[PDB]
């Protein structure tokens, strides 16, 4: 009964409301969140203190360019789907919001979320929406020094500092313009990093997540339903094309939790935390990945996509050598047999 029982084996999604004081130091608050067990659910929500905002107004923006809008074509039945991404073409934000609101792409009448969620799972294969995803850029004003996705100051910076290597969306910020029914397939971050997502404005974004302690179970299930993909790639889920309904997870005993994120709220994914979801309507989110000392081990063991030749791969060398000098030799010689304890928070006894 070692002190793992923080987010007692309920590993549920937790919500936090930090003080402007606690809020100032990013890396510190993540450590606090983990001491409260929030990482056990794979996903956590953080509401910024009232007197905080990254930008004055988003009135000056409909001119921003979405260089690679994506139409999401979904195929499948009864809980299991595969999403193909048809890349449309150059588009301005003004053109997007108009389509996003056009009565044939807009959200429909719904009482409770429970109902909006049902309409989503019943109609996701109809009316292929468009998602203004992976747009390089930020909406934070240069002076915002708290939780600025553009410069979080975490050790993920070592990658940049050590080799000058830049990785869009990972090492850099991304903007996501949503629309109803636009969704993100089940996945963990590249190299099993952490991710931070801020919903600048618009309709909500709902999230589903599986506790990292049960991530392996989700993979076994995924492999079983798509044996074809599982054989061609060691980590086919990283392709971000697999959708699985909450009802299917329920049916096969895979533990998970739900949460809806609203404008002005932060979402944090944790190492090896599988997540997925969908946007309610016209949206705008920003995200990037970040690391922590606790992440290093996950990074060393992350199973990567073996079929695409332009998929993200970060050299762990600088991390092991810098934060695990005693194990560098062991590791560098394919020996280090460290088992990960998903409950344990960064600091160790
Ligand atoms: Fe993600
Ligand atoms: Zn692959």
Curated annotation (Swiss-Prot):
<feature type="binding site">
    <location>
        <position position="189"/>
    </location>
    <ligand>
        <name>Fe cation</name>
    </ligand>
</feature>
<feature type="binding site">
    <location>
        <position position="240"/>
    </location>
    <ligand>
        <name>2-oxoglutarate</name>
    </ligand>
</feature>
<feature type="modified residue" description="N-acetylalanine">
    <location>
        <position position="1"/>
    </location>
</feature>
<protein>
    <recommendedName>
        <fullName>Lysine-specific demethylase 4A</fullName>
    </recommendedName>
</protein>
<feature type="domain" description="JmjN">
    <location>
        <begin position="13"/>
        <end position="55"/>
    </location>
</feature>
<feature type="binding site">
    <location>
        <position position="197"/>
    </location>
    <ligand>
        <name>2-oxoglutarate</name>
    </ligand>
</feature>
<comment type="function">
    <text>Histone demethylase that specifically demethylates 'Lys-9' and 'Lys-36' residues of histone H3, thereby playing a central role in histone code. Does not demethylate histone H3 'Lys-4', H3 'Lys-27' nor H4 'Lys-20'. Demethylates trimethylated H3 'Lys-9' and H3 'Lys-36' residue, while it has no activity on mono- and dimethylated residues. Demethylation of Lys residue generates formaldehyde and succinate. Participates in transcriptional repression of ASCL2 and E2F-responsive promoters via the recruitment of histone deacetylases and NCOR1, respectively.</text>
</comment>
<feature type="domain" description="JmjC">
    <location>
        <begin position="141"/>
        <end position="307"/>
    </location>
</feature>
<feature type="binding site">
    <location>
        <position position="131"/>
    </location>
    <ligand>
        <name>2-oxoglutarate</name>
    </ligand>
</feature>
<feature type="binding site">
    <location>
        <position position="305"/>
    </location>
    <ligand>
        <name>Zn(2+)</name>
    </ligand>
</feature>
<feature type="binding site">
    <location>
        <position position="307"/>
    </location>
    <ligand>
        <name>Zn(2+)</name>
    </ligand>
</feature>
<feature type="binding site">
    <location>
        <position position="233"/>
    </location>
    <ligand>
        <name>Zn(2+)</name>
    </ligand>
</feature>
<comment type="subunit">
    <text>(Microbial infection) Interacts with HTLV-1 Tax protein.</text>
</comment>
<feature type="binding site">
    <location>
        <position position="205"/>
    </location>
    <ligand>
        <name>2-oxoglutarate</name>
    </ligand>
</feature>
<feature type="binding site">
    <location>
        <position position="239"/>
    </location>
    <ligand>
        <name>Zn(2+)</name>
    </ligand>
</feature>
<comment type="similarity">
    <text>Belongs to the JHDM3 histone demethylase family.</text>
</comment>
<comment type="subunit">
    <text>Interacts with histone deacetylase proteins HDAC1, HDAC2 and HDAC3. Interacts with RB and NCOR1. Interacts with VRK1. Interacts with FBXO22; this interaction promotes KDM4A ubiquitination.</text>
</comment>
<feature type="binding site">
    <location>
        <position position="187"/>
    </location>
    <ligand>
        <name>Fe cation</name>
    </ligand>
</feature>
<feature type="binding site">
    <location>
        <position position="275"/>
    </location>
    <ligand>
        <name>Fe cation</name>
    </ligand>
</feature>
